[PDB]
């Protein structure tokens, strides 16, 4: 009696150019970005410009680097926390 009756398949999406390759990781595109690990987690948050940003670095460094390190665009600030 371990069968399921319903599942809400909850996830987020983020902008990129294509879903076959990854410029910020070396892993499946659906996992955490490796740039925050191998190139030093990948907490990816949405902004007003409709390009996500890494919220474990902007929470400290947005004062100097108000960009989206995981995209190709500058960041327009909306959320700086959880």
């Amino acid at each position: 009696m371990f069968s399921l009756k319903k599942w809400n398949a909850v996830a987020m999406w983020s902008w990129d150019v294509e879903c076959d390759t990854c410029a910020i990781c070396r892993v499946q595109v659906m996992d955490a970005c490796l740039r925050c690990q191998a190139e030093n987690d990948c907490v990816v948050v949405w902004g007003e410009c409709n390009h996500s940003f890494h919220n474990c670095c902007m929470s400290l460094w947005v004062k100097q680097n108000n960009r989206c390190p995981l995209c190709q665009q500058d960041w327009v600030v909306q959320r700086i926390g959880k």
């Binding site: 399921l4 599942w7 398949a9 999406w13 294509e18 595109v29 949405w46």
Partner: protein, 723 residues
Amino acid sequence: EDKWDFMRPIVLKLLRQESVTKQQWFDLFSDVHAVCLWDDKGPAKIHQALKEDILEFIKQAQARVLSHQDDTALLKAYIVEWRKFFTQCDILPKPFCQLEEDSIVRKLMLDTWNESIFSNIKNRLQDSAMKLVHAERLGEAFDSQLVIGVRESYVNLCSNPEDKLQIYRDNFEKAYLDSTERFYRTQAPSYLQQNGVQNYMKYADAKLKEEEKRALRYLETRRECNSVEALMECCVNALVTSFKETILAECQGMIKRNETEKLHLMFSLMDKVPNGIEPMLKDLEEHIISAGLADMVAAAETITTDSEKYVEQLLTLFNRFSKLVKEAFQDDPRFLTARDKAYKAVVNDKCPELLANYCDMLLRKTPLSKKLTSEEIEAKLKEVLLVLKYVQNKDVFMRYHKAHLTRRLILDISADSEIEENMVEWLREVGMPADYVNKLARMFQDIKVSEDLNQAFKEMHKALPADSVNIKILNAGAWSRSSEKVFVSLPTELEDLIPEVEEFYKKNHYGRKLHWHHLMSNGIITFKNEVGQYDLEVTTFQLAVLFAWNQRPREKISFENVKLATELPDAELRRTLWSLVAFPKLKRQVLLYEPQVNSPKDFTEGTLFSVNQEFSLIKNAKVQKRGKINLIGRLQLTTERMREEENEGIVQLRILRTQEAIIQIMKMRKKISNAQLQTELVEILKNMFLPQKKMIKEQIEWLIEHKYILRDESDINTFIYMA
């Protein structure tokens, strides 16, 4: 030279303002012509005969003035006698020409009065007229026309056609200017020590306003000196300025004590003088800083997480001095500014982050929005707006508010669609940038995207059958709230379901890359136990925990064993189990445990759990035989922990946001002084983080010590940007 045997009948009757025919006065012009044409002395006697006939009238007028003994009869008799005489000073001296306006006969009329009899009459006119106002100022109902008539007389007694500052200026103007100032300076002691400052100011203001009304009566308003203004200057200096130091001394008392009735006159008078209103602005500012911190030094740091307790105590502090201003100063914009500037030193003792958590209680389906009606919810949001207008740390409000808006929309847990939309105008009334104002519109569009992506899969792919799968693909910020990217073991029905959803979007919707959170996905599992049937609607973490339970609900499993069965770390299993063993406001729990705990942290690797064999949906405290129970609770939200994890960010923002503004300002301000930087910071930080200089000074300097901003080799207070 005293021989107007034919013309006195007209001149003497006019001098007394008797009825005289218009023709007779007109004919007088041809009679004085006849006098200079048909006489022996005409050309020489006309102006001397005028003097002698005037002199006789003037002496008679003196008797008809000075013979009176009362102040009213003495003053009025002169006024009547003069008004008759002066009226004719523009009529009788029209004829009588070519005898040397500026005629000799007019000069003789005006000068004969002043030289012959005014040498003694003017001291009694001033003494009586001064006594009138001296008594009138005490409430004696004197005839105000007596000092008006003297005013009219003395401005008319001036005979110089080029410089009329004479009889009136000396025998009246100064006497009233000096005597009224002395009167009020010597009257003030009757109130200075006998009553309160409020009641003194009532006397000072009442006497000044009444004297102003009198000033426009007895002080020539068109005089070449504006005596009225000069009087008001000496009167307000006699009444208010001589008391200003004590009027201000009790401003700290009245303000600190919230004596809003006694500040009524305080505002009316002190708001008129920059050197009185400003001390009061600093007195309110300083008392708010001292009184505010006396309460906030505890409230801010001992309440921490209770948003209703903090904000109501912050509103208690806010209302204590906002009520003071709203009453004492009629909601004044300068005392609100002094209030707002004061709180910038207070409310950061570390920040009013709970204003946004309190808003979320007002904006989310919480008891605060269930026990209040729509007007009360909007009223409380307006009260927060009045608070937020002064708060120095505003990005912590947006930090929480925007995180809360995101989670409210994606979970469909908002108090109302209209309440969410009202925050768009609410933030525009605050004055926040569009980047934050329109977050609701951005989330609304993102909800549509999720629904369109959901149907895109459900209508094409049909792992768990698609009829039991509901996909929700939100913006990156919807779920990316933690670094703990934990993924949990699941039965085949779910384990082989996500890869298909992922591959669908990889090829059917290029670019939109998914990222999954097993803390957020949820589902339904059917159970039977020893009392009835039930369906658990729980998160995917909980589904994996239930999977361990599904085939063995009566077998005791250790915390360590669940960790191994589900592949969860301590943090997620402690939170996951809590929602099953200690769910809030639940009559019967799903999972049982033997140890006593206080919180999720107290679950140890040796802790044993089991499934509650009496669990089911409970209605009115009655056990049901079938039903669906949702135990997701706060797992899809942010628990109290949110403050513990965000507190570090709140501290970081206390420096970050200022230095963000500085770096941005310095990019566009290549070389500026600290005073220019702080000036720019006020404008940039107004919607983020604008403390008092007691924090800024260090924050601008720290960018020098840590080698972020360059400074002038010859001026440590001028910052230089490079590149």
